[PDB]
């Protein structure tokens, strides 16, 4: 009830040994009242790393998108060695969304690394289970034999009426993920542990399907964008092996389902001037002229019989002199071109100084057209080249025309494919013009360049008209245990890709949310523009390029930081060699680098001084020493993980404050939230995500089960809590409900259409639905569109959430009237109470807690000691936690080494790994999340609590309590003990 105190463990272990003589009764009582629960103390066991590999394919569904709905791929297993290093060889195949499925090595929810089906963004199948949201549903496949070393998994996805289906060795798997989220780009993905070999069969030249695709399902190999080639890559990698060493990688650049839609500028509503008519005639003439030249150049014969089969030119006259449909076919060229031109800020010239008259007509007798003439009015330009503004205008117009035509095809019902077929309404150029390959770009822009250069020959006026916050920069800093407070240190940073990869030194308390140099906890240099960064940005040095290495050095004796580039010291604007000076030693300094999107940098701290280039040029004679010169093990780093994880509200938060008001009488013990700086400076209005620290856990067995009636209250299985929304706070901004421990969405302007949901429809071989259970990571009322919300009134809206831990329902009520939300969950689900609020008032929300008639308060659910206590209370464990966007995460010392390569045109791409790798994972029981045991090197509170837990274990098994020792062998096993022995970090 009072939280994790390291002194209560001291009390417990002092309760065990009486001045050299142990008391068996107390030792057994501790081991029977604390250990069996596995809920208070931190559990730990060894697990394997899980790595996921995807093809370079992204398919998505959107309104008016240029991509097909049906896709189908497969993976064949070649060799699996199960139970290498005493753990089941994880192997799952499925789809995954491009926004949300970003598994990182180590950590993860529950136990072990996260693979396909570990969260609601991905949906997997390991052979006999359908994995989704870290919950396995046993599927009734005809084989039910896992993924054997000889096995085939064919996976298909129909994005319209969303469904994902699997087929093992041709047998239909009796289970389908349905009605999932379409907000993103699905990609094929295989998650695996060490010791597997599989071949990715995408179809076509990239492998051959051993089973036919279902009717209407296109092969996945033809979804490759024309700008790229097929390749196997990790999902989201912050590290990649290189020649000199590991290369840190920033956040990847990813597309979106709205990027495959064309959105051209409407030009039919654009009015036309008489200038359009005046210029359009001669522009159409010149179009005919350049074309006649091409007709002469091509086999196209000069035959006025108008027969395309005999390659005959229809017009065959210098003046266009055509029938009406041909004439307007020539003129609407210029008509639509000038409409798109004037839709922008561009005007139209009127033959300034008779420039068209000045420009002459140079006829060439060699290109004589038998019918048109010796030369069909060549209209040679007067060496008027295309202005760069004009060329950008051409590409702009080319993009517009391509988008218009693609929109037409899409409205007709066309889809993009790498191969082209006409009957199935498929095109290889239907992708938007930004995603187009350069050749078709040239083919589209050639005629437009000719038109623009003709207009420039005439007198014409020339005038022109991933990336989310906390997901754009990856911060790699040295571990907090390597802080330097004295001496001369030097470390290098190679810039493999030019851009924003700010490099320098930083304080140990570098906040990962704030960018480097925007605060006082960083001293960095941004070589994208050369600008140094400390509490602002100032000009310095010079911009870098590819291959440039920055040898950042610090002098604690001289209180300076100096940046050198390629062996020469970078000087400031004033000419001072030192970039920063008078730098207080303070707590210490750490090497740090913040890489941007699609950015690659090689951070060489100096473990190999021979590998430290330019160190002899700068640093060796100056007295500077390589960072970690004599260190044997490599320096561990901490990347700024972007996973949104709930953490407690700081007591000194500059804007939000949590007040712990006492229950008193006619009021329940409640946690009220207030906005300190509301209606003043720094009055930010952002979507705040809040939850209570303790979860309520549904019963494992789902049985049918004024004055407070004692027998009803003794047999009560339901629990109640409520949230008060004050008069100032708009009810359209509060979202009252529950969240699973797998909620990691920090998107602003949250709405119930942005929740993660999936219905795992399990069925029978005949087709009858076995079950249609639903899975979601959060269950809230639609407070934004609440009938209770529907006019600003002084009343306060109280929303109660009656949850039956036995039945499984979570019925909501608003102001006594029962709401029509009846979310029903599966057994053994933990559900933290939560509200998401957009602050519109100083008094925003209040977690009232408490109880009603014949209902427990929520404290009875959270706390087992107060299970039968009907008095509402707020023990110090209960607190309000706000969602953090990013947090520090330890980079694993060794990563799973995966080799991906194509064997041939028949076999195709193959993924292989054979190097076993294990980590010890510390698992928080209430939050259902685990991290490295090595990660406790900076989390000192968890370090101390776990150390005193180990001390309690030793004290309770001490003095020959062999029964307790046997009991403790389950919590701490031989493999864990030996790995902790051999673990140097």
């Amino acid at each position, epitope marked *: 009830k009072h939280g994790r105190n390291h002194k209560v463990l001291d009390v417990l272990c002092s309760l065990c040994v009486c001045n050299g003589v142990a008391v068996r009764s107390n030792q057994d009582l501790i081991t029977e009242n604390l250990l069996p629960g596995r809920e208070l103390l931190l559990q730990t066991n060894l697990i394997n790393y899980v790595t996921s590999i995807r093809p370079n394919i992204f398919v998505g569904r959107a309104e008016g998108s240029t991509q097909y709905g049906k896709w189908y791929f497969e993976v064949m297993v070649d060799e699996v060695v199960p139970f290498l290093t005493a753990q089941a060889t994880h192997l799952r195949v499925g789809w995954a969304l491009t926004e949300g499925y970003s598994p990182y090595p180590g950590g993860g929810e529950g136990w072990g690394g996260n693979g396909v089906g570990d969260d609601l963004y991905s949906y997997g199948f390991d052979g006999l289970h359908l994995w989704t949201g870290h919950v396995a549903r046993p599927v009734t496949s005809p084989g039910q034999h896992l993924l054997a070393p000889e096995d085939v998994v064919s996976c298909c996805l129909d994005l319209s009426v969303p469904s994902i289906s699997f087929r093992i060795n041709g047998c239909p798997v009796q289970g389908v993920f349905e009605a999932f989220n379409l907000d993103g780009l699905f990609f094929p993905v295989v998650s695996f542990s060490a010791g597997v070999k599989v071949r990715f069969l995408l179809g076509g030249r990239h492998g051959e399907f051993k089973f036919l695709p279902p009717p209407g399902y296109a092969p996945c190999h033809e979804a490759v964008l024309p700008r790229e080639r097929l390749r196997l890559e990790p999902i989201k990698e912050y590290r990649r092996e290189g020649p000199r060493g590991p290369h840190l990688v920033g956040p990847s650049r990813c597309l979106s389902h709205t990027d495959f839609v064309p959105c051209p500028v409407d030009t039919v509503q654009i009015v036309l001037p008489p200038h359009l008519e005046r210029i359009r005639e001669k522009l159409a003439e010149n179009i005919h002229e350049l074309w006649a030249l091409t007709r002469i150049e091509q086999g196209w014969t000069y035959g006025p019989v*108008r027969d395309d089969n005999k390659r005959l030119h229809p017009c065959l006259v210098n003046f266009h002199s055509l029938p009406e449909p041909e004439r307007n076919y020539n003129l609407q*060229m210029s008509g639509e071109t000038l409409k798109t031109l004037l839709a922008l800020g561009c005007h139209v010239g009127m033959a300034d100084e008779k420039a068209e008259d000045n420009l002459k007509k140079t006829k060439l007798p060699k290109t004589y057209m038998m019918s048109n003439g010796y030369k069909p009015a060549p209209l040679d330009l007067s060496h008027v080249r295309l202005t760069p503004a004009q060329t950008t205008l051409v590409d702009r117009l080319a993009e517009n*025309g391509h988008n218009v035509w693609a929109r*037409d095809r899409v409205a*007709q019902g066309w889809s993009y494919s790498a191969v082209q077929d006409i009957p199935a309404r498929r095109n290889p150029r239907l992708v938007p013009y930004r995603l187009l390959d350069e050749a078709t770009k040239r083919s*589209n822009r050639d*005629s437009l360049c000719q038109a623009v250069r003709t207009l420039l020959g005439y007198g014409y006026n020339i005038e022109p008209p991933n990336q989310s916050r906390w997901d754009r920069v990856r911060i790699f800093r040295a571990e907090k245990s390597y802080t330097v407070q004295s001496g001369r240190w030097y470390f290098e940073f190679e810039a493999v890709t030019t851009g924003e990869m700010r490099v320098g030194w930083a304080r140990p308390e570098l906040r990962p949310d704030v960018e480097l140099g925007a605060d006082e906890l960083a001293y960095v240099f941004n070589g994208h523009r050369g600008q140094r960064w400390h509490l602002g940005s100032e000009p310095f040095g010079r911009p870098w390029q590819s291959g440039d290495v920055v040898g950042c050095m610090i002098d604690l004796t001289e209180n300076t930081i100096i940046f050198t580039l390629n062996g020469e010291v970078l000087m400031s604007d004033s000419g001072s060699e030192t970039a920063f000076r008078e730098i207080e030693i303070g707590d210490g300094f750490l090497p740090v680098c913040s890489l941007g999107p699609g950015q690659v940098g090689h951070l060489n701290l100096g473990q190999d001084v021979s590998s430290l280039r330019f160190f002899a040029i700068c640093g060796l004679q100056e007295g500077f020493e390589p960072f970690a010169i004599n260190m044997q093990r490599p320096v561990t780093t901490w990347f700024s993980k972007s996973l949104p994880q709930f953490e407690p509200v700081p007591p000194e938060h500059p804007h939000y404050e949590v007040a712990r008001m006492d229950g008193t009488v006619d009021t329940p013990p409640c946690l009220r939230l207030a906005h300190r700086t509301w209606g003043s400076q720094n009055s930010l209005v952002e979507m705040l995500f809040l939850r209570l620290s303790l979860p309520v856990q549904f019963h494992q067995h789902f049985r049918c089960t004024n004055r407070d009636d004692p027998e009803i209250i003794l047999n009560t299985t339901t629990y109640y809590y409520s949230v008060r929304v004050f008069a100032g706070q708009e009810p359209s901004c509060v979202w009252v409900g529950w969240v699973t421990p797998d909620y990691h969405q920090h998107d602003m302007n949250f709405d119930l259409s942005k929740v993660r949901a999936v219905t795992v429809t399990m069925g029978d071989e005949q087709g009858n639905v076995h079950s249609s259970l639903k899975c979601s990571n959060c269950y809230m009322v639609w407070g934004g569109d609440f009938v209770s919300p529907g006019r600003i009134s002084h009343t306060d809206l109280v929303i109660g959430c009656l949850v039956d831990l036995a039945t499984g329902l979570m019925t909501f009520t608003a102001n006594g009237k029962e709401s029509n939300t009846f979310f029903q969950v599966e057994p053994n689900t933990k559900l933290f109470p939560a509200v998401f609020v957009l602050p519109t008032h100083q008094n925003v929300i209040q977690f009232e807690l408490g109880k009603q008639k014949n209902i427990m308060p929520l404290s009875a659910a959270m706390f087992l000691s107060e299970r039968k206590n009907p008095a509402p209370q707020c023990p110090p464990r209960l607190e309000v936690q706000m969602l953090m966007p990013v947090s520090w995460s330890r980079m694993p010392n060794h990563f799973l080494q995966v080799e991906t390569r194509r064997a041939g045109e028949r076999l195709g791409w193959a993924v292989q790994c054979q190097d076993p790798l294990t980590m010890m994972a510390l698992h928080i029981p209430e939050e259902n999340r685990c991290m490295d045991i090595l990660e406790l090197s900076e989390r000192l509170d968890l370090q101390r609590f776990h150390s005193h837990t180990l001390r309690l274990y030793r004290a309770v098994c001490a003095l020959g309590n062999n029964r307790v020792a046997h009991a403790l062998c389950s919590h701490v096993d031989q493999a864990q003990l030996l790995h902790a022995l051999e673990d140097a970090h």
Partner: nanobody, 126 residues
Framework: QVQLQESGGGLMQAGGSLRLSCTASGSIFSINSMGWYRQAPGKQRELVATITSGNSINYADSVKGRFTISRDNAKNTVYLQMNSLKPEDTAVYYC?????????????????????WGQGTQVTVS
């Protein structure tokens, strides 16, 4: 936008007149030409004598036989008259309403790629 349907099939001896009616309901954007293509069983689809708005005549590679193809623009309907018949003429005929006319492509690639297809109809010859 422009939905066009081709109808008219029959079986009779060589020399039987055949009226093939293709109706294009929609905008006049695709009125520029009414192309016709025949898919013979096991043979590359090949081109028919095509008319552009105003009934411009242009004989094609498979123009063998009497291709009396005409069309009205009031309801955008094109009728092809196969007066002659040959055993090799047995094929599925498809009509397309497209804004590119016959052998007339000065436009860009997208404007050359505007094309609307149709159902088509199998025609057999005794």
């Amino acid at each position: 936008q422009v939905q066009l349907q081709e109808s008219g099939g029959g079986l009779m001896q060589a020399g039987g007149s055949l009226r093939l009616s293709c109706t294009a309901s929609g905008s006049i954007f695709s009125i520029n030409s009414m192309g016709w293509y025949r898919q013979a069983p096991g043979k590359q689809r090949e081109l028919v004598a095509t008319i552009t708005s105003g009934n411009s005549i242009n004989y094609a590679d498979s123009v063998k036989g009497r291709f009396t193809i005409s069309r009205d623009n009031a309801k955008n309907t094109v009728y092809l008259q196969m007066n002659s018949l040959k055993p090799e003429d047995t094929a599925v005929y498809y009509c397309n309403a497209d804004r590119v006319p016959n052998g007339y492509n000065p436009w860009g690639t997208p404007n050359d790629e505007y094309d609307y297809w149709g159902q088509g109809t199998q025609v057999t010859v005794s």
